[PDB]
Amino acid sequence: NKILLVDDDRELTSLLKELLEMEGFNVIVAHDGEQALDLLDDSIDLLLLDVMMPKKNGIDTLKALRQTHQTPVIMLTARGSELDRVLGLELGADDYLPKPFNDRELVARIRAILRRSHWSEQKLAA
Numbered sequence: 001n002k003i004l005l006v007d008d009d010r011e012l013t014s015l016l017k018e019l020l021e022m023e024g025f026n027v028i029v030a031h032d033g034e035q036a037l038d039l040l041d042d043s044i045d046l047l048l049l050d051v052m053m054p055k056k057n058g059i060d061t062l063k064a065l066r067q068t069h070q071t072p073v074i075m076l077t078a079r080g081s082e083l084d085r086v087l088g089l090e091l092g093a094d095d096y097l098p099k100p101f102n103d104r105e106l107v108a109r110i111r112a113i114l115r116r117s118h119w120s121e122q123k124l125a126a
């Protein structure tokens with residue numbers, strides 16, 4: 001499974017890339033919304049997307065990517081109010097996990113959405 005990490009915090013993306021690779025995932029990193037849209041293609045199984053970023057924020061990235069891709073999206077951001085969470089989900093995100101986050105919960109939420117993608121793939125092939 002291929003994950004596209006989108007966050008301007010280079011310290012967080014390096015830490016998360018290492019954590020997720022250790023959990024068996026293939027991770028590619030984007031540091032803004034424009035780079036994310038450049039790297040988003042059919043090979044991506046899931047996006048981890050931040051909100052507050054320079055050039056193009058996560059909400060605008062989500063709106064743009066949803067015009068062409070149905071790729072699973074988990075918002076992963078310091079914008080964790082109940083409002084922020086509802087907004088993200090309604091704009092097209094599958095899940096919303098505020099920062100600070102628990103490593104194990106992040107990995108389990110990634111695995112839960114990719115398990116649903118696998119169920120859909122099995123059904124589609126049949």
Ligand SMILES: [Mg+2]
Pocket residue numbers: 050051052053077078
């Ligand atoms: Mg942030």
